[PDB]
Amino acid sequence: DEKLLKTIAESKYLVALTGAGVSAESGIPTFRGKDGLWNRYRPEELANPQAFAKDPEKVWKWYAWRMEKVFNAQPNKAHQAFAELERLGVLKCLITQNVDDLHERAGSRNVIHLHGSLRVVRCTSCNNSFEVESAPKIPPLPKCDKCGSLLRPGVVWFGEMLPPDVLDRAMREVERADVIIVAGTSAVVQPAASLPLIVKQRGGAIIEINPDETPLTPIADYSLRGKAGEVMDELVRHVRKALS
Amino acid sequence: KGGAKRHR
Ligand SMILES: [Zn+2]
C-alpha cells in the first residue's frame, strides 16, 4: 500500500493506459474469447479489412451490435475511479485501447483513443465523419450521405496503422510521465503494448492493474490482481485521502 | 514502437 500510494500521490505527471478489462464490469466482453454474437469467429477475424471486403454486411451487423451494447452500458467503478483521479489533478492524460465511450461518460476529459471509437462512423472514400447517438440497423449497409460510398465504424482494425497523430500524441504523453497506471490490458496488442515501456526506459514507474499476469508484469513495479473496479475504487479512495 | 495494429 504505502509505497504504492506514495508513488501515485507524489507523481508529477501520471498517465494511464487502459484496455478491455476495465469495461467488462459494464457488461462489455473483453473480446479475448470469441466474437460474442455468433461466437463463431475470433474478434480479430471480424475486426479487419479482409473480413470487411468479403462481407461488409456481416462485419456491420457485428459492429451495430457492439455499438448498441456499449451505448446502453453504464460506466463502472473503474471508469469512475479514473475520472476521479483526473478530477483530483493526479491523472494528466488517459490513453485507452478501448473503442467504448465509458471513460468519457464517467467524466474523463483528456482521453486518447488509440484504436478509435464506436461512437464514430466514417466514409470509406471521402473525408466525411460523424458521431452517432444510437446504433444503425443492418441491413441496409450504411451509405455516406455526401458521396454514397460505404460507411464503416471509426475504429482501427487489426492490420491497419493507428492514425499517426494519435499514436504520436500518446508517445509524447508517456515520454513525459514519471508514473503510468496500466489497467485491464493483456499487453499483447502492438503498438499499444509498447507505451508503458517508454515510461520505464526513462526511469518512471509502472503500476499494473490486471486480474492476470501479462507480458508486462516482469517490469511492473507493482502488479495488482483482483477485479478492476474494486481495485481502482479502493486505490482512488486511498489516493484521495493521501492528498486531502 | 509502431507498425500496424497486431498481436505480439
Ligand atoms: Zn463519403
Same domain, A128 and A244: no
Size of interface A-B (CB pairs under 8 A): 40
Q: Are residues A188 and A241 in the same domain?
A: yes
Q: Which of A131, A161, A191 is the last residue of a domain?
A: A161
Q: Which of A130, A161, A192 is the last residue of a domain?
A: A161
Same-domain check for residues A108 and A137: no
Nearest CA in chain A to B4: A161
The reply, when asked if residue A26 is annotated as ligand binding, is yes
The domain boundary, picked from A92, A127, A161, lies at A161
Nearest chain B Cα distance for residue A165, angstroms: 12
**Domain carrying residue A47:** 28-74+116-161
Residues of chain A with Cβ-Cβ distance to B6 below 8 Å are 158-159, 189-190
Q: Report the distance separating Cα A80 and Cα A104, nearest Å.
A: 10
Cell output for A93: 492524460
User: Under a CB-based contact definition with an 8 Å cutoff, are residues A153 and A120 in contact?
Assistant: yes
Instruction: Examine the domain organization and report whether A142 and A223 are in the same domain.
Output: no
Resolution to 1 decimal, in Å? 1.8
Q: Do A92 and A212 sit in the same domain of this protein?
A: yes
With beta carbons under 8 A apart, name residues in chain A contacting B8: 188-190, 193, 215
Among A103, A113, A115, A238, the active-site one is A115
The reply to whether A138 and A223 lie within a common domain is no
For residue A188, what is the nearest residue in chain B, using CA coordinates?
A: B8
Q: Does A36 appear as a known binding residue?
A: yes
Residue A107 phi/psi, 5-degree rounding, is 110, 10
* A151 and A176, same domain (yes or no): no
Counting the structural domains of chain A, the total is 2
User: Residue A167 corresponds to which cell in the numbers above?
Assistant: 499514436
Residue A174 shares a structural domain with residue A220: yes
Same domain assignment for residues A157 and A55: yes
The 3 state secondary structure assigned to chain A is CHHHHHHHHCCCCEEEEECHHHCHHHCCCCCCCCCCCCCCCCHHHCCCHHHHHHCHHHHHHHHHHHHHHHHHCCCCHHHHHHHHHHHCCCEEEEEECCCCCHHHHCCCCCEEECCEEEEEEEECCCCCEEECCCCCCCCCCCECCCCCCEEEEEECCCCCCCCHHHHHHHHHHHHHCCEEEEECCCCCEECHHHHHHHHHHCCCEEEEECCCCCCCHHHCCEEECCCHHHHHHHHHHHHHHHHC
Would residue A115 show up in a list of annotated catalytic residues for this protein? Answer: yes
Q: Are residues A34 and A151 in the same domain?
A: yes
Closest C-alpha to A209, from A18, A14, A6: A18
- Around ion ligand 1, residues with a beta carbon closer than 5 Å are A 123, 126, 128, 144, 146-147, 149
Vertex A102 angle, CA A96 and A106, to 5°: 110
Residues in chain A with CB shorter than 8 Å from the CB of B7 are 44, 158, 188-190
User: Rounded distance, CA A78 to CA A18, Å?
Assistant: 10
Q: Is A29 exposed, middle or buried (0-12, 13-18, 19+ CB in 10 A)?
A: middle
State how far the Cα of A196 lies from the Cα of A200, in Å rounded to an integer.
Answer: 7
CATH number at residue A240: 3.40.50.1220
Centre of ligand 1 from the C-alpha of residue A149, in Å: 5
Residues A138 and A240 in one domain: no
CATH, residue A50 = 3.30.1600.10
Q: Are residue A39 and residue A99 in the same domain, yes or no? A: no
- Specify the experimental method: X-ray
